[PDB]
Scaffold this active site. Structure first.
Site, PDB file in Angstrom:
ATOM      1  N   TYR A   1       0.836  -1.187   0.000  1.00 14.42           N
ATOM      2  CA  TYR A   1       0.000   0.000   0.000  1.00 14.42           C
ATOM      3  C   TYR A   1       0.873   1.239   0.000  1.00 14.42           C
ATOM      4  CZ  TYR A   1      -4.274   2.525   1.327  1.00 14.42           C
ATOM      5  OH  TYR A   1      -5.376   3.330   1.417  1.00 14.42           O
TER       6      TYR A   1
ATOM      7  N   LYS B   1      -2.829   8.193   3.876  1.00 17.80           N
ATOM      8  CA  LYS B   1      -3.942   7.968   4.781  1.00 17.80           C
ATOM      9  C   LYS B   1      -3.643   8.320   6.234  1.00 17.80           C
ATOM     10  CE  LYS B   1      -6.944   6.411   1.847  1.00 17.80           C
ATOM     11  NZ  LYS B   1      -8.130   7.174   1.353  1.00 17.80           N
TER      12      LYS B   1
END
Ligand SMILES: NC(=O)c1ccc[n+]([C@@H]2O[C@H](COP(=O)([O-])OP(=O)(O)OC[C@H]3O[C@@H](n4cnc5c(N)ncnc54)[C@H](OP(=O)(O)O)[C@@H]3O)[C@@H](O)[C@H]2O)c1
Ligand SMILES: NC(=O)c1ccc[n+]([C@@H]2O[C@H](COP(=O)([O-])OP(=O)(O)OC[C@H]3O[C@@H](n4cnc5c(N)ncnc54)[C@H](OP(=O)(O)O)[C@@H]3O)[C@@H](O)[C@H]2O)c1
Ligand SMILES: NC(=O)c1ccc[n+]([C@@H]2O[C@H](COP(=O)([O-])OP(=O)(O)OC[C@H]3O[C@@H](n4cnc5c(N)ncnc54)[C@H](OP(=O)(O)O)[C@@H]3O)[C@@H](O)[C@H]2O)c1
Ligand SMILES: NC(=O)c1ccc[n+]([C@@H]2O[C@H](COP(=O)([O-])OP(=O)(O)OC[C@H]3O[C@@H](n4cnc5c(N)ncnc54)[C@H](OP(=O)(O)O)[C@@H]3O)[C@@H](O)[C@H]2O)c1
Ligand SMILES: Oc1cc(Cl)ccc1Oc1ccc(Cl)cc1Cl
Ligand SMILES: Oc1cc(Cl)ccc1Oc1ccc(Cl)cc1Cl
Ligand SMILES: Oc1cc(Cl)ccc1Oc1ccc(Cl)cc1Cl
Ligand SMILES: Oc1cc(Cl)ccc1Oc1ccc(Cl)cc1Cl
Ligand SMILES: N[C@@H](CCC(=O)O)C(=O)O
Ligand SMILES: N[C@@H](CCC(=O)O)C(=O)O
Ligand SMILES: N[C@@H](CCC(=O)O)C(=O)O
Lengths: 254, 254, 255, 255
Positions: free
Chosen positions: D156, D163
């Site tokens: 990710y 995030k």
């Protein structure tokens, strides 16, 4: 004991810098040190401060971490001058006061992105270049603040940059783990430094630690430095992706 | 360097105990050590084990942490035999085997309260009694597991005991901080020990670390003992209420 | 959110200020059938009065002291016989002795530490085991916690360690009971004036801290806890389990 | 809930699989008036078609590329003149290059890192600033995040760091806007098959791991996120701000 070890320390401006606390501890333990700086004025302070350490020679490199070429050429030059290294202490952040002293919701785009760049992305690129001088593995420490974990008054855009930095340490830990390179953060309590003057309400933050934190006192740069020694040495083998709070226990209370 | 420090280490069962890892490391560093044990298979044992250390005497005390009297009188007697101490390593936990497998929702009240008692409350009382031997301050470390922060298969009642133990550390840090006593935990990764045998599915936990933790390897008792030396010494003076994961980075990934 | 044809057991109403009465008002208002459990006859007498405020056509009232395995076991089994299957449980129960809620945590007695764990944490475990028998198609258990479970708060002391234990209990229950379609969650309530808050040293300065420092700059009340309980106990929160939702004006997010 | 006479801006619908579309269906069913923002002219075309499945008697579609202040500024101003004041914004927008995503994290380009910060985190700040002008009585803002903001998740990479930044942005906005009675919160959604999920290396093993390991032993879907959104956007969640609600079958709670 850190004889025969070599650490790069980034982000000393003067004698109050947190990275100078690190420097004194690591120097006291017999490490060879290499320093990086941005402004001329900071090289000058480094040249003076070295007179208090035991480093037999000045290893000073200009690296503005906004520039890829400077980070890449910097570390390449360090490798040519001193060989492989054992770790990097990263002590670098920046944001505009015009953004910091406004409401967080009014932060400008350029200023939010400036803070991410210097305060977080700089670790990614430094690790990438430093990895090249650590073929047997090593240790990378960055300095964070509890405002990366909770919303603190006035810390604003920097708090978002520190949240980004702490995730950066965790993704680097994961990426570089197989190469035996550990990556960790120290979350330092408030300390009077040149940069602290950008944090609105700073004296209030110091006083709240004395009155509320478990140890009922503030920390200093040598304390951050002693935990850096632990993290940069083999004492903390097994420990990676971790955020160690050197803050008199303030993180643990509410 | 821990010459002229004295530490009480609680929880050695055999050569594999995490606490014995702690002991080899503090012993190598020149500390005077004192050991407590639960029952008389651990003693006979213990005595033999300590020929591997440079301790020039055997200071051993029976203390079952389920008894106030035994804890109260054990620290009293330690105090009389060696004087003030500098810290305490707590490496002690228990639950009934039936409970560490199958269904947490089926745990008995007795079994739940027994794990709390031995694995959590024992730190509170050991802290209260140890404080008496630390008028100038000192350092208390307990050993926890990720299963106190996350629900992990099989660990069940012991995970709720470690959640409780982790809070215990924070509340003791807050309480004892003004007396200059730091209280911290080390969240160890999985390690093959006598007690590990009773954890359902231990071998799979072991393998999961190798495959998924940043360092792609498991840790050992000596890596715990090195972070214990940090936390027990003045390298960590700014650090309290903290939980340090010596788990190859596992805590940082998902 | 409409809860007609649902049935919820609410544990730990003592009086009109009880957090669980906020929950009751909200659930009742959404059309749920409610079953109430109490420990002391005084709480039952209070429940009888408070019911006259609710739309419930009948009083379903059961004495359950959660220190007793038999009272929990026989209580839920009796509940199953009177109302049939249930949809969830709101757990609003804690206790510790006075002396363990001000001054010095290191002086906590073993008996007081284990009492607090027994009532404030283990109760949820055995309640869930027994309640599960009434939830064969799945359901929803919510417990009430406090921020002192996550951080050392002055005075909260032994209850804080009890709340930490509760919050891990919720996670282990969630994992254990998920495959049965039973969700387990906590609400971390901000400080609210109730009978039991009279036990927390310095409670008034806690409230005032929230007003000055929390993002919303005001305290929460029991109905706001009941509104989040309605979400957790209903199909709006399908997908959500093992979770701790802070109804506390933001205070958990700031330092 | 009950959302008639409420108006929400939903940002980030690309097609019928978008998480925001699950939000839209739930809110629309609950009686809200919805306003939609898009970047690509192709996403507008999908909206015009998805709107036939909805009870919206009017199509309120606005182009807003959150890379551009002008567009967010003029976009919300236009929304304000076309629909008056709004009750909340659902933010479902993120972006990073494949070339950064599908390399080692430590090899991320400066320009791809700042791109992901700019679209996936900074955009909430400026959106919040402009949307505040249309919320003089207060309201609610919800952003979408993922567990990779809290832990290092394989593949990710640069989005994990964006995030993390987005989760902190939520807390800092909660604090700043709380006095204005504007709540700001995040939903942390489990993996869901969407167009953007195609960017995440190993996405299918992420799904499988949720089914084998999460407390609920199944994946979630867009409607589940929509239902927690309805809670967060409505008065049920009064008192909740700076919060991150994991809509992920409990997976956040297990290791
Ligand atoms: N003081 C505290 O209370 C506190 C608490 C927790 C965390 N921290 C963190 O500690 C770290 C060190 O700060 P400090 O407090 O010791 O203040 P400091 O002495 O002012 O150091 C900040 C350093 O950042 C360097 N820097 C800024 N932008 C740079 C760039 N583009 N390239 C290279 N270097 C750059 C500065 O170098 P030049 O002067 O040469 O420009 C200076 O050496 C920061 O990350 C800070 O956020 C501080
Ligand atoms: N090994 C791991 O992977 C793991 C991981 C994380 C944390 N930990 C923690 O590390 C600590 C040590 O465990 P370990 O793995 O090293 O196992 P261990 O060698 O078996 O040690 C457990 C010790 O606890 C002692 N003990 C149990 N009940 C006691 C009582 N009532 N009074 C006094 N002492 C008592 C035992 O004494 P007796 O032998 O005399 O019964 C034994 O010495 C525990 O707190 C454990 O939860 C272990
Ligand atoms: N008020 C707050 O600021 C606050 C904040 C966050 C969390 N909480 C939590 O909210 C929950 C409810 O407390 P509250 O503030 O609403 O206070 P409350 O009105 O005093 O309610 C406490 C309830 O606990 C019950 N109880 C205690 N021991 C019990 C036992 N052994 N068996 C069955 N019931 C027992 C009491 O019943 P009897 O009177 O019949 O004995 C009473 O109904 C607790 O978990 C509390 O820790 C409160
Ligand atoms: N799918 C999952 O498993 C998952 C899990 C957790 C969190 N989330 C989050 O949920 C949100 C929605 O993603 P999704 O999975 O629903 O995928 P999606 O359907 O592909 O939606 C992504 C949306 O982002 C918009 N966007 C990207 N850059 C933009 C820009 N510069 N200006 C305006 N809009 C922009 C796209 O608009 P255009 O198409 O017009 O370019 C698209 O509408 C994201 O924040 C994502 O990180 C997804
Ligand atoms: O992160 C910090 C936290 C605190 Cl409490 C004090 C100083 C800090 O350091 C900085 C703060 C603002 C800027 Cl612009 C740059 C730096 Cl180095
Ligand atoms: O906490 C532990 C965690 C792991 Cl992975 C392995 C061993 C552990 O230690 C124990 C486990 C169960 C019991 Cl009954 C006693 C102890 Cl000392
Ligand atoms: O958990 C609480 C937190 C707060 Cl701020 C106020 C009240 C609380 O509730 C209790 C506190 C102490 C005891 Cl003995 C029992 C209960 Cl129910
Ligand atoms: O955040 C997400 C998390 C998951 Cl598991 C799946 C999809 C996600 O959404 C994105 C992922 C990558 C990019 Cl480039 C853009 C978006 Cl919207
Ligand atoms: N006096 C500054 C604070 C900066 C500091 O104390 O360093 C302000 O509050 O505006
Ligand atoms: N005045 C007492 C009573 C406690 C309370 O008000 O909760 C105290 O603060 O210690
Ligand atoms: N094919 C991609 C996976 C992409 C996806 O799963 O969305 C890979 O490299 O794993």
């Amino acid at each position: 004991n850190l004889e025969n070890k070599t650490y790069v320390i980034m982000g000393i401006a003067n004698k109050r810098s947190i990275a100078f606390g690190v420097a004194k501890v690591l120097d006291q333990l017999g490490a060879k040190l290499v320093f990086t700086y941005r402004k001329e004025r900071s090289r000058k302070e480094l040249e003076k401060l070295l007179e208090q350490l035991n480093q037999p020679e000045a290893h000073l490199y200009q690296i503005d971490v906004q520039s890829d070429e400077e980070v890449i050429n910097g570390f390449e030059q360090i490798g040519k001058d001193v060989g492989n290294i054992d770790g990097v202490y990263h002590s670098i952040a920046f944001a505009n006061m015009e953004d910091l002293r406004g409401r967080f919701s009014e932060t400008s785009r350029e200023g939010f992105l400036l803070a991410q760049d210097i305060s977080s992305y700089s670790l990614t690129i430094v690790a990438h270049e430093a990895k090249k001088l650590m073929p047997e593995g090593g240790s990378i420490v960055a300095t964070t603040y509890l405002g990366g974990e909770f919303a603190v008054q006035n810390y604003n855009v920097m708090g978002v940059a520190k949240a980004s930095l702490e995730a950066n340490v965790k993704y680097l830990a994961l990426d570089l783990g197989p190469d035996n390179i550990r990556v960790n953060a120290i979350s330092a309590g408030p300390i009077r430094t040149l940069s602290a003057k950008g944090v609105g309400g700073f004296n209030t933050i110091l006083k709240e630690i004395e009155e509320r934190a478990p140890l009922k006192r503030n920390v200093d740069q040598v304390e951050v430095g002693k935990t850096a020694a632990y993290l940069l040495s083999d004492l903390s083998s097994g420990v990676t992706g971790e955020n160690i709070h050197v803050d008199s226990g303030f993180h643990a209370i509410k």
